Amino acid sequence: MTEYKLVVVGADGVGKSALTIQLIQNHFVDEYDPTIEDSYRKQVVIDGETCLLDILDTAGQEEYSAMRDQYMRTGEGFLCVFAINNTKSFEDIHHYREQIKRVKDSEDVPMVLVGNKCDLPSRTVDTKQAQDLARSYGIPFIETSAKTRQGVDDAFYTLVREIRKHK
Numbered sequence: 001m002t003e004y005k006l007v008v009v010g011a012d013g014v015g016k017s018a019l020t021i022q023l024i025q026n027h028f029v030d031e032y033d034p035t036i037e038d039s040y041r042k043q044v045v046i047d048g049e050t051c052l053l054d055i056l057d058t059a060g061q062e063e064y065s066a067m068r069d070q071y072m073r074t075g076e077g078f079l080c081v082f083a084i085n086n087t088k089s090f091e092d093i094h095h096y097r098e099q100i101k102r103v104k105d106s107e108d109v110p111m112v113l114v115g116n117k118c119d120l121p122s123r124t125v126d127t128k129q130a131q132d133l134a135r136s137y138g139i140p141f142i143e144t145s146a147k148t149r150q151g152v153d154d155a156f157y158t159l160v161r162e163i164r165k166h167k
């Protein structure tokens with residue numbers, strides 16, 4: 001069975017855990033329980049292929065930044081999440097991309113830019129500005145909501161397709 005190693009990264013509070021738990025369990029976590037590092041293994045069918053998704057839900061708290069080196073070496077694709085109402089999380093994206101590129105020693109790492117919390121009216125990052133950043137990196141961009149499930153399956157399945165197409 002083809003196995004895909006996905007890593008969910010981004011600033012503290014953007015909704016990494018809520019996105020992962022929505023994808024796998026189909027419900028929304030309202031509480032904010034900061035992550036150290038959790039992992040999940042889930043079988044899914046993507047484009048008629050039974051896939052094993054190995055999903056690593058990482059820490060956004062900068063206190064755990066030394067753990068990034070290990071997961072960036074082993075991860076095959078990265079879901080780079082910011083929240084549409086948190087401009088600092090959007091600026092933090094570039095730092096995660098640069099770190100991943102350095103650890104892999106490559107500019108062609110499978111990645112998807114995710115603008116989460118798109119259900120909220122408190123937007124601070126225009127969709128066009130995020131589209132422009134994703135175009136500069138050569139990666140897909142999707143807006144998501146862990147509350148409504150908008151874009152959630154597409155974000156994860158697009159990342160699988162980016163890994164599959166790169167190999």
Ligand SMILES: Nc1nc2c(ncn2[C@@H]2O[C@H](COP(=O)(O)OP(=O)(O)CP(=O)(O)O)[C@@H](O)[C@H]2O)c(=O)[nH]1
Binds near residue numbers: 118
């Ligand atoms: N309205 C809304 N709230 C969201 C969304 N995704 C997450 N949240 C909320 O944001 C808060 C943080 O979510 P969480 O999933 O813990 O974020 P995280 O990025 O994993 C936090 P850490 O980096 O510390 O592990 C929670 O209150 C959660 O309900 C979303 O799409 N919409």
Ligand SMILES: O=C1NCCc2c1[nH]c1c(-c3ccoc3)cccc21
Binds near residue numbers: 039054
């Ligand atoms: O190497 C592994 N052996 C088998 C079990 C396993 C391995 N990596 C995993 C990850 C993961 C994703 C990105 O990096 C690591 C997530 C969940 C389970 C994993």
Ligand SMILES: [Mg+2]
Binds near residue numbers: 016017033035057058
């Ligand atoms: Mg978390």
